[PDB]
Amino acid sequence: DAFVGTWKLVSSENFDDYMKELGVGFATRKMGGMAKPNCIISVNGDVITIKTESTLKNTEISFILGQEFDEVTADDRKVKSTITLDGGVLVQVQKWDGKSTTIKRKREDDKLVVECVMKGVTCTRVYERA
Numbered sequence: 001d002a003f004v005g006t007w008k009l010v011s012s013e014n015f016d017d018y019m020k021e022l023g024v025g026f027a028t029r030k031m032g033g034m035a036k037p038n039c040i041i042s043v044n045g046d047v048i049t050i051k052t053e054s055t056l057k058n059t060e061i062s063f064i065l066g067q068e069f070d071e072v073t074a075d076d077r078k079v080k081s082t083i084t085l086d087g088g089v090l091v092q093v094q095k096w097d098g099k100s101t102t103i104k105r106k107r108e109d110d111k112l113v114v115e116c117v118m119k120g121v122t123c124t125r126v127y128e129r130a
């Protein structure tokens, strides 16, 4: 849809603070912060696939909107994820150990804008088409 494509990170705001709030350690935050991932989004019927690729870590999820799934995150959290489409926004919640974080993926002009919230910390990651 609006989301399908190959996208490259072009800017990041507050990612270090977000990783800290998630409980990511210093060494991993150091490696993660200077990464410039690509994100490849595809759809085949009910099933959406999001691949996030980088030099030091690749992840992939495939899901059906509204259907909870188990996910191991890039930082090795074992979470329950649910992704829904709300007003053109892909809204992902990840739940684990009584905590949650929300990851919203939105299309804005030429950008794929990713807003990540954990407690008081909001991180914005901006991607453009490769």
Ligand SMILES: O=C(O)c1ccccc1NC(=O)N1CCc2ccccc21
Pocket: 031, 032, 033, 035, 037, 052, 053, 054, 056, 057, 058, 059, 074, 103, 114, 116, 125
């Ligand atoms: O990066 C993002 O914008 C991102 C945004 C929302 C949710 C997950 C994310 N990131 C992610 O899944 N990965 C995978 C591998 C890797 C290496 C370095 C930094 C990040 C990531």
